Amino acid sequence: MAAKVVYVFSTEMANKAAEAVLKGQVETIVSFHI
Amino acid sequence: VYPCGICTNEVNDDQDAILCEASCQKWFHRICTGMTETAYGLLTAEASAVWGCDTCMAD
Ligand SMILES: [Zn+2]
Ligand SMILES: [Zn+2]
Known part of the structure; x- marks a missing residue:
C-alpha cells in the first residue's frame, strides 16, 4: 500500500x-514544465 | 525466444531492447521503435519513467 x-x-x-537534455534546455527527461 | 512487437524477429541478448510497461508487455528492438540511443540511455537511467509503445499510447 505504498503508491x-x-x-x-x-x-x-x-x-x-532527449533532444531537450542534449540542448541543455531541461535538467532531466521528467523535468516537465508548463 | 521473444518476438519484437514491431518487426516480429527474435530479440537477442546482444541487441538494444525495451519493454512496453504501458500495457501490452511486449519487448521491442530500440531500433524498431525509432527511439534514439540517447532516449534509450536517458529513459532507462530515469527512475520514475517507463516506456509505452505506440498502439498502447493511442488508446
Ligand atoms: Zn524489431
Ligand atoms: Zn504496448
Whole structure:
C-alpha cells in the first residue's frame, strides 16, 4: 500500500525529451514544465 | 525466444531492447521503435519513467 507516480513516455516524447537534455534546455527527461 | 512487437524477429541478448510497461508487455528492438540511443540511455537511467509503445499510447 505504498503508491507512486510513474510517467509513461511514447517514443516521440522520449526522443523529444532527449533532444531537450542534449540542448541543455531541461535538467532531466521528467523535468516537465508548463 | 521473444518476438519484437514491431518487426516480429527474435530479440537477442546482444541487441538494444525495451519493454512496453504501458500495457501490452511486449519487448521491442530500440531500433524498431525509432527511439534514439540517447532516449534509450536517458529513459532507462530515469527512475520514475517507463516506456509505452505506440498502439498502447493511442488508446
Ligand atoms: Zn524489431
Ligand atoms: Zn504496448
